[PDB]
Structure formats: structure tokens, C-alpha cells
Amino acid sequence: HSLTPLSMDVIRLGEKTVIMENLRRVYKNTDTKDPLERNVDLT
């Protein structure tokens, strides 16, 4: 029931505002691949 003020970047579009987050800071120098870097197959 308590909130903590933290700062991020916000995009404004279509009368809705969206938080922008680059998760590269989490997966640095570790074994597990960042799931947002996906592979795609086309035939």
C-alpha cells in the first residue's frame, strides 16, 4: 500500500503512455541467453 518513486523513460502515443525498458542491463556477462534475441526460420 506504499509506493517508491523511480525514474524511467515513457513514450506517449495514442492517448496512452508506455514504459520503455532495455533489459540488456540484466543479462550482461552471464551464461543464459536474453530471450528477446530470438531466431526466426523462413522456408
Binding site: 550482461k28 556477462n29 552471464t30 551464461d31
Partner: protein, 49 residues
């Protein structure tokens, strides 16, 4: 007669290391006893998340 109007010397201006921005990449340290030693090492200990 033949006239010698003037004689001139080189007005060469000195240059110095720290006065050049190239020292910005550097970090200059003076070390009198450097002539005695032959090796220099630094050790890094890093663990991963």
C-alpha cells in the same frame, strides 16, 4: 662595399608532453627507481552474475 644588413638565428619554440592533449589519453608518473626493475603487473579478480 657589400652590406650585411642582418643576421638571424632560429627562434625555435619548445614543446612539452603535458601541454599536448595527447596526454589526456595518458597518465604520466615519474619514477626514479624504474631503471632497477624489469616487470610491471596488475591483477584483476572478477566474478560473473
Amino acid at each position: 662595399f657589400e652590406a650585411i644588413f642582418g643576421t638571424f638565428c632560429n627562434r625555435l619554440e619548445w614543446v612539452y608532453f603535458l601541454t599536448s592533449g595527447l596526454a589526456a589519453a595518458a597518465h604520466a608518473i615519474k619514477f626514479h627507481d624504474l631503471n632497477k626493475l624489469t616487470t610491471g603487473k596488475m591483477l584483476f579478480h572478477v566474478q560473473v552474475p
